[model samples]
Target chain A: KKKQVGILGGTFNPVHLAHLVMAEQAGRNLGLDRVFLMPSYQPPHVIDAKHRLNMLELAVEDNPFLQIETIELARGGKSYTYDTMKELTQNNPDTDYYFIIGGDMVEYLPKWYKIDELTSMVNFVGIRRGYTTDTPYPVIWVDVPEIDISSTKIRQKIKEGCSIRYLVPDKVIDYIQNEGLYEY
Target chain B: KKKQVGILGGTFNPVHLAHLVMAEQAGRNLGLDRVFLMPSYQPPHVIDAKHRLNMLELAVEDNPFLQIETIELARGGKSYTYDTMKELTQNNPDTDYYFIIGGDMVEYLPKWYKIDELTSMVNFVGIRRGYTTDTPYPVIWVDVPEIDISSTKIRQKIKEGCSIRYLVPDKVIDYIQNEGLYEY
Candidate 1:
């Protein structure tokens, strides 16, 4: 029996509500068994991969369906969506996958590394925040209202002494405060 | 031109991660313009409606797509799903609605007040955690993995002095602690 799983790849420097929404959207609409929130363990200078992983862990605790896929972290030099999906597909032969991405990413789909091979491996789910008629690749458009949020904004908020309380999970906020993340 | 809007009505004693995830599920998957987390303002017995409302405000700050609908609160009486939906339908004839509910509530749909009227009002979204064999109602079954969470359990944890950190937003936990909610 083939099981359906949703893939949502991002740095997740500090997972925000938007990321959670996207995961839930795909998980539910696609009838997926589980949704993976893959956090890229980027090159060391981009803040600790460990911190990102920890924040992801804390953020997903309440949602059992939301998973933290760490394959990119393990593969690790530079995270490429194609490479990660290839490995995932090879490992789970009996699973069907849905790759969730924003509408903005649709225009750039053809430019992704090994885009052809990657598109063939999983069904692409485009969360349409804005209308787009031009798409070089096949996409299943899901309408999710736009939420303007980014890790950069959150990091800046922390640095500026602005409260990032509701922007993240309580444990993640506490972890950041205790670890003094982005305080420099 | 009835646009779709997601409805997530609850007592919201203290909104947690699960609520947020469900809101995301309905908002994005159902192609809703926005998802409203309607907090019921019951008589002073349940957790303060204002407190829950305030917590919801802080919690949804990062996700602008989620709204806190106060129609029930303004009605100033027992919040009946039928009445709420009826009034909302009357007010916004141009908007469609999808009411999201946990899978556990599926079996009890028939027992709700004004069952016939409620069933005909809006499209129902069931977040399925387990397998189902019957199709008694025309429901959009979304396979979102079960998140084991409840206000009762959360309140109990708080009274036991257990850490409810990752279970909710940072601001929510702060409000609970500052107000000493569920400490009785």
Candidate 2:
């Protein structure tokens, strides 16, 4: 008997309320047995790794359904989706993996490492970008408007001394401020 | 008599509560005579420019201090900071220019075209990220924490069919659903 598990992966620069909300939504909507919050050790595309991991830890602290996986961060290498998927499948062969990704990211799915093989192992779930609906792969499209927020913008707001209270979860914002993370 | 005008630019993809809050903060903290919310015509690096503009329009609709500049979008070309600054200055030379940017973007200040000239032309205002703040440039650093909510995560939640009532302004979220803006 196979179990259904949803995976939400990101740098989690600081897990905000949005991360928790998205995970819960996916879990409930898809009727999954569990949802895993996988934070990459060092995202290959992002410039900073250590800084992001520390933030991720603080962000996911109190969430029950959200669990952090250190396999990628502990691996001490550029985190790759295919590599992580392979590891997850091997360890939990009895589980069906639903990989949740943004709509825009899904557009470039074919270009991901060993994408053909990766697609076979997991069900691709894509959220809406805004008005567009074009995705490169055969994904289960979840219709939703783009929220128009980004960590980059949030970080920039912070540098400029702008409040991000409504932009993120109050608790996450409090943690980030309390821990003095991302100040550089 | 040099009038200080601040230019806050972003995709403003479905303007939310935070965008408005930051605009107000920038206005009060920076002591600007006026703040222009410039939505990129064709953001050099974003997923949906058209949709971004639509949301931006609604976000700043009620604010008198904030005005939307469609110059970049009207120009029908790549939206560059230098170009926009140059155009704005040329049109309003009597006014001092202050380009509002986040702390993270302040680090990438060197990448902007004619950065030296731009710096001289306009004052750089950097909002503090949730925690970090080390920029070498001459900036008016404001201490605003990172908002933990994100449009991307919000969109993901909506796609997963989650309630986003408080995450975004109730009116804006309702508009998004009524218009079927981000729905695929």
Most TM-score-accurate candidate: 1
Give one digit per residue, the lDDT tens place, for model 1 in B1-184: 6688889988788888778867775566555788899887688653666787888898898777888889998877887798889999999988778888888888888888897887788888888664572659867876433345577777876887655544577789998889878898
The regions of model 2 sitting more than 4 angstroms off are: A43-54, A134-136, B1-184
User: Which of the CAPRI classes, incorrect, acceptable, medium or high, describes model 1?
Assistant: incorrect
Q: Interface RMSD for every prediction, one decimal?
A: 12.7, 6.0
DockQ of each: 0.03, 0.07
Superposed model 1: Cα runs more than 4 Å off: B1-184
lDDT of 1 at A112: 89
For this target, which candidate reaches the highest DockQ against the unseen true structure?
2
Report iRMS (Å) of candidate 1: 12.7
What share of the reference contacts survives in each candidate?
A: 0.00, 0.07
* TM-score for chain A in each prediction: 0.94, 0.84
